């Protein structure tokens, strides 16, 4: 029997996929997680004990972003092998895919939290290879189910590209994306490109430099917006400023503010 339900903070969440917690953890009805340290437990009683004992009120690592009550924590999988191992076991419940939980050292994880008087509550995250051969700025990304479709996912994407901009480099997420992933990326890419086309003869490589979005990713977005033509084996941006505004006017809640970022490579 696999883990099929978890309790974390005040949420219970049914599982979507196999996650390889140790066998005897699968045995139990629920898995219980501390929402701050992400320790997993077998019973409500050991859960309750831990709750009144645990001193953590936030993720470990560095708070590299604070706007209002939104915070992002940078955790090095080398500094905190266990927390990150726990994070990955948690994420694998909802990511079909994921392939890596135990080897976490090569990764750095970014934890989105929304803060109240009690502490900083994890909402989603994205991991990132410290050194990427394939140029992926986002190894795995996810918003916890009860928080999905509210702009947190798109906030994370925005954020992963802000880091790329500060590294003066372009990146794409590692594939395959989930269907929610595809949608969110295509939506983010669209918004960013349309917003910029509103404000005169930019090349695709120019757009690529400004946004840190790869050329393939810009091209494929522009195709779906119907704003690129094919000429002699070359993708050519064909934009009518009345179809930019036209697309914008058509049908995120939370956005990355470069000022409130506290980072450097
Ligand atoms: Cl659920
Ligand atoms: Cl305990
Ligand atoms: Zn804890």
CATH number of the structural domain spanning residue 123: 3.40.630.30
CA dihedral sign of residues 184, 169, 162, 76: positive
Residue 188 CB coordination number (10 Å): 21
Q: Residue 124 is inside which H or E element, if any?
A: strand 120-129
φ/ψ of residue 57, rounded to 5: -125, 25
In three-state secondary structure terms, 31 is strand
Report how far residue 181's alpha carbon sits from residue 85's, in angstroms, rounded to the nearest whole number.
23
Whole-number Cα distances in Å, 1 to 24, 25, 148, 202: 9, 9, 27, 56
Report how far residue 128's alpha carbon sits from residue 76's, in angstroms, rounded to the nearest whole number.
10
CA dihedral sign of residues 185, 112, 110, 86: negative
Residues 65 and 105 in one domain: yes
CATH code, domain carrying 25:
3.30.60.60
Assess whether 129 carries a catalytic annotation: no
Residues 66 and 127 in one domain: yes
Experimental method reported for this structure: X-ray
Residues 148 and 80 in one domain: yes
Resolution of the experimentally solved model in angstroms: 3.0
Could you give the dihedral angle defined by the CA atoms of residues 153, 83, 163 and 96, in that order, rounded to the nearest 10 degrees?
-40
Half-sphere exposure of 231 (CA within 13 A, CB side): 5
Report how far residue 43's alpha carbon sits from residue 253's, in angstroms, rounded to the nearest whole number.
37
Nearest to 43 by CA among 7, 16, 84, 87: 7
φ/ψ of residue 230, rounded to 5: -105, 120
Nearest to 157 by CA among 183, 182, 185: 185
Estimate the crossing angle of helix 204-211 against helix 179-198, to 10 degrees.
110
Environment class of residue 134 by beta-carbon count within 10 Å: exposed (0-12), middle (13-18) or buried (19+)?
exposed
Residues 138 and 184 in one domain: no
Determine the distance separating the centroid of ligand 2 and the alpha carbon of 135, expressed in angstroms: 41
Determine the distance separating the centroid of ligand 3 and the alpha carbon of 13, expressed in angstroms: 18
Cis amide prior to 16 (ω within 30 degrees): no
φ/ψ of residue 119, rounded to 5: 160, -165
Q: Are 120 and 114 in contact (CB under 8 A)?
A: yes
Would you say 149 is a known binding-site residue? yes
Q: Are 157 and 141 in contact (CB under 8 A)?
A: yes
Among 16, 37, 55, the domain-final residue is 55
The residue count of the chain comes to 265
Q: Residue 229 is inside which H or E element, if any?
A: strand 228-231
Determine the distance separating the centroid of ligand 3 and the alpha carbon of 119, expressed in angstroms: 12
> What single DSSP character describes residue 80?
-
| Catalytic entry in 63, 174, 195, 245 | 174
The two three-digit tokens of residue 5, written as one number: 């339900």
> Max alpha carbon distance in the chain (Å)?
68
Which domain covers residue 137, as residue numbers? 56-176+247-265
The two three-digit tokens of residue 256, written as one number: 């990355």
Residue whose tokens read 């694998």: 92
């Amino acid at each position: 029997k696999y883990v099929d339900k978890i309790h974390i903070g005040n949420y219970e969440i049914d599982a979507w996929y196999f996650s390889p917690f140790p066998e005897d953890y699968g045995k139990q009805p629920k898995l219980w997680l501390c929402e701050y340290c992400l320790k997993y437990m077998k019973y409500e009683k050991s859960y309750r004990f831990h709750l009144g004992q645990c001193q953590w009120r936030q993720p470990p690592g560095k708070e590299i972003y604070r706007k209002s009550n939104i915070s992002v924590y940078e955790v090095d999988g080398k500094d905190h092998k266990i927390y990150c191992q726990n994070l990955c076991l948690l994420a694998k419940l909802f990511l079909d895919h994921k392939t890596l939980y135990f080897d976490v050292e090569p990764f750095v994880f970014y934890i989105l939290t929304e803060v109240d008087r009690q502490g900083a509550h994890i909402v989603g995250y994205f991991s990132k290879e410290k050194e990427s051969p394939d140029g992926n700025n986002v190894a795995c990304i996810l918003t916890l189910p009860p928080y999905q479709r509210r702009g947190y996912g798109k906030f994370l994407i925005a954020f992963s590209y802000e880091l790329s901009k500060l590294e003066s480099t372009v990146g794409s997420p590692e594939k395959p994306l989930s269907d929610l992933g595809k949608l969110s990326y295509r939506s983010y890419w669209s918004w960013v490109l349309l917003e910029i086309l509103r404000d005169g003869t930019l090349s695709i490589k120019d757009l690529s430099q400004m946004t840190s979005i790869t050329q393939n990713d810009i091209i494929s977005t522009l195709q779906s917006l119907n704003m690129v033509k094919y000429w002699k084996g070359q993708h050519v941006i064909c934009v009518t400023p009345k179809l930019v505004e036209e697309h914008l006017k058509s049908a995120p809640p939370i956005t990355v503010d470069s000022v409130c970022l506290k980072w450097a490579p």
